[PDB]
Amino acid sequence: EEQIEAFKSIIQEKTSNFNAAISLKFTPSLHG
Amino acid sequence: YEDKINVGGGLSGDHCKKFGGGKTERARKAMAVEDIISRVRGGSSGWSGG
Ligand SMILES: *[C@@H]1O[C@H](CO)[C@@H](O)[C@H](O)[C@H]1NC(C)=O
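A: This is the predicted complex of the input protein with 2-acetamido-2-deoxy-beta-D-glucopyranose.
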């Protein structure tokens, strides 16, 4: 009698996030 | 920063990785051989043979 078994499992994940919060406000009539 | 001239700037990054690996291997082997031979010089042709 002969018997053999083989199991394999692989999982891959890669997150990514990139904020950008930049504001401009200027007032010395003139306004910005 | 701002001085009454204003300069604006802002950045925020986020990175993440999730890796996974799994392996399984199973082997099962069995071998059996049995032989039984009986030599009988009893003196019976058919009945002794049986
Ligand atoms: C933005 O910033 C927050 C807090 O710092 C962070 O959790 C997130 O991963 C960033 N990126 C996004 C929301 O895309």
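Chain A touches chain B at residues 1-28, 32 (CB under 8 Å). The beta strands of chain A are 2-19.
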